[PDB]
Design a protein around this ligand. Structure first.
Ligand SMILES: O=C[C@H](O)[C@@H](O)[C@H](O[C@@H]1O[C@H](CO)[C@H](O)[C@H](O)[C@H]1O)[C@H](O)CO
Ligand SMILES: O=C[C@H](O)[C@@H](O)[C@H](O[C@@H]1O[C@H](CO)[C@H](O)[C@H](O)[C@H]1O)[C@H](O)CO
Lengths: 134, 133
């Protein structure tokens, strides 16, 4: 399972959509979508979106100065081992909207300034069919 | 069956309209409108008009009964008989129209986003889902 990692040197603005399509492997534990503020390991994360099949939860968080913030959890787990999925992460002036399947799943208010985002990473236990940034 | 639904407080950067459907095999043309009201030929902040009969996709606005300058996208990323997915994505500068897996055209705003009040989808199109995110 090849991870995705791509630079956003120009940044992301309100009205940016990240579309992720793929499949949860039948033996999956967890996977993640990070919007990061730099290339280096331990860089701050404006958004860490972490569907957790092993603990039946989807955790949202940020990271600054090597420390994770307050966790937010979405309602239920709209993911299943062995099943394909589609996620939109939509940036607005107020935060990130996570859409899974046909419904908004959770809204994550900005903690870091949106202007600090310059990298998108998708990895973990996930088979990626397509990642695109519009 | 056409779609028509209200956006009573307008929209904002980060508003996404997702349309999934199918172009009938004898289709001539269909439309996606973002309108600023309900009565009249209300002002159109966005008129997105795939035209299978004339092989063009036209974008325009309408204000006080008059159409703006037409913009056309590159090619026609729709086909008679084929299913499609469109995203119309509002930013502060304009609408990003995504068709299939690629941005198709960027339409800079002529009307303010706050004035949008209605989404209408119709014409020769079969609609599986229309969602505003
Ligand atoms: O069960 C609740 C805990 O609060 C748990 O969530 C935390 O897990 C980390 O959470 C991070 C984002 O918060 C990130 O995903 C990292 O990978 C996870 O180890 C703890 O540190 C380890 O128990
Ligand atoms: O190139 C051809 C013309 O410029 C043509 O495209 C215009 O057609 C209208 O275009 C509107 C959007 O501009 C909208 O689709 C409307 O319904 C259409 O009648 C003309 O006014 C028709 O004489």
């Amino acid at each position: 399972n090849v991870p995705h990692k791509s630079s956003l040197p120009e940044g992301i603005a309100p009205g940016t959509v990240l579309r992720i399509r793929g499949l949860v492997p039948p033996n999956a534990s967890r996977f993640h979508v990070n919007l990061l503020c730099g290339e280096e390991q331990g860089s701050d994360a404006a958004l860490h979106f972490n569907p957790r099949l092993d603990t039946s939860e989807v955790v949202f968080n940020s990271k600054e100065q090597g420390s994770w913030g307050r966790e937010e959890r979405g309602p239920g787990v709209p993911f299943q081992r062995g099943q394909p999925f589609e996620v939109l992460i939509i940036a607005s002036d107020d935060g990130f909207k996570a859409v899974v399947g046909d419904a908004q799943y959770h809204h994550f208010r900005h903690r870091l300034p949106l202007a600090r985002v310059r990298l998108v990473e998708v990895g973990g236990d996930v088979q990626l069919d397509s990642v695109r940034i519009f």
